[PDB]
Each structure stands twice: as C-alpha cells, then as structure tokens.
Amino acid sequence: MILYDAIMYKYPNAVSRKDFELRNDGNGSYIEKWNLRAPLPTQAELETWWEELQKNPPYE
C-alpha cells in the first residue's frame, strides 16, 4: 500500500515534500521525515485509513 494516499485521506491540509518527506521503496512510498505536530500513526491506523479509502471512493 501507499502511505501518501492514507496521509491524504486524514490530512488534506498537509503538504507532501514539505510537512512530511516521503521515500520510494518500490512497493510503495512511506514516511522518511516527519515535521508535523501529530503522533506517528500505527499499523492499525495506517491500515484503517487505507481500508476506509479503498472501501469508499472519494467524491472526485
């Protein structure tokens, strides 16, 4: 899965390559640098955002 998508689901006002630095693993992109005043999300949290995002298509 991709962290970027999950982050964009919960934090629409957060800027990538700015507030948080992403790194490309190849199987996905995850969090390298964290400059946000927010606790580091847990596995369950990361999965839940993905679960909620993929089970519910955003209103594009």
How is the largest sheet built, in terms of strand order? 1-2
* Strand runs, count: 2
Roughly how much helix do the residues carry, as a percent range? 25-40%
Structural class: alpha+beta
Number of helices: 2
State Rg: 11 Å
Question: What is the N-to-C succession of helices and strands?
Answer: HEEH
Largest sheet, described in full? 2 strands, antiparallel
User: What is the end-to-end distance?
Assistant: 21 Å
* CATH fold description: Phenylalanyl-tRNA Synthetase, Chain B, domain 1
CATH class: Alpha Beta
Please indicate the percent range of residues in DSSP E strands (runs of 2 or more).
15-25%
Number of separate domains: 1
Shape descriptor: globular
Report on this model:
By secondary structure, the chain is of the alpha+beta class. 35% of the residues lie in helices and 18% in strands. The protein is built from two helices and two strands; from the N terminus they run αββα. It has helices at residues 3-10, 43-55; strands spanning 20-24, 29-34. The chain has a two-stranded antiparallel ribbon with strand order 1-2. β1 (20-24) and β2 form a beta hairpin.
Describe the structure concisely.
Helices cover 35% and strands 18% of the residues.
List the helices and strands and how they pair.
Layout: H1 3-10, E1 20-24, E2 29-34, H2 43-55
Antiparallel strand pairs: 1-2
Which key phrases capture this entry?
about 60 residues, about 35% helix, about 20% strand, alpha+beta, 2 strands, two-stranded antiparallel ribbon, Phenylalanyl-tRNA Synthetase, Chain B, domain 1
